[PDB]
């Protein structure tokens, strides 16, 4: 029970598909391009996460600030509750003070 | 990334291998065998 009885379908990786072969190209776009662009401008993703990092409370606060006016009501309500929950957790509970 | 244990079967047999000559349910049921194998060692 719990362990598969046949080998899984073999996994073939093309180590030289175009995505892998060109990975990292232009990561020095600033230092090699007269700093017209910053490498963070190459990051694609949510508008609230490009070239920025934080813990989960900071991300939720940042997402609420920037796209919160555009969120669906159920999702915005969950985000409000999540911020409140993390607010209590990070400010009032834990081993260290 | 959801990681689940995949070789638990082999972890279990490492105890059960020493319990096979015991009597009763403590020769096959890990919960019981693990305690009697520790005592045996």
């Amino acid at each position: 029970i719990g362990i598969r009885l046949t080998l899984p379908p073999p996994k073939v990786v093309d180590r030289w598909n175009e995505k892998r072969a060109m990975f990292g190209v232009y990561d020095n776009i600033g230092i090699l391009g007269n700093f017209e662009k910053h490498p963070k401008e190459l990051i694609r993703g949510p508008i609230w996460l490009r070239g920025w990092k934080g813990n989960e409370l900071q991300r939720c606060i940042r997402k609420r600030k920037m796209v919160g006016s555009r969120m669906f009501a159920d999702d915005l309500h969950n985000l409000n509750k999540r911020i409140r929950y993390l607010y209590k957790h990070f400010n009032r509970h834990g081993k260290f003070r | 990334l959801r990681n689940r244990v995949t070789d638990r079967y082999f972890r279990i047999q490492e105890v059960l291998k020493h319990a096979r000559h015991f009597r009763g349910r403590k020769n096959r049921c890990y919960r019981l065998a693990v305690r009697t194998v520790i005592r045996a060692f």
Partner: peptide, 26 residues
Amino acid sequence: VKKGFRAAFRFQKELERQRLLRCPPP
């Protein structure tokens, strides 16, 4: 179904050892 290969391979080796003990070859 769990991800991975190693335990499945390792379990295959154990099923193969049992078959030999079950049916030892000439």
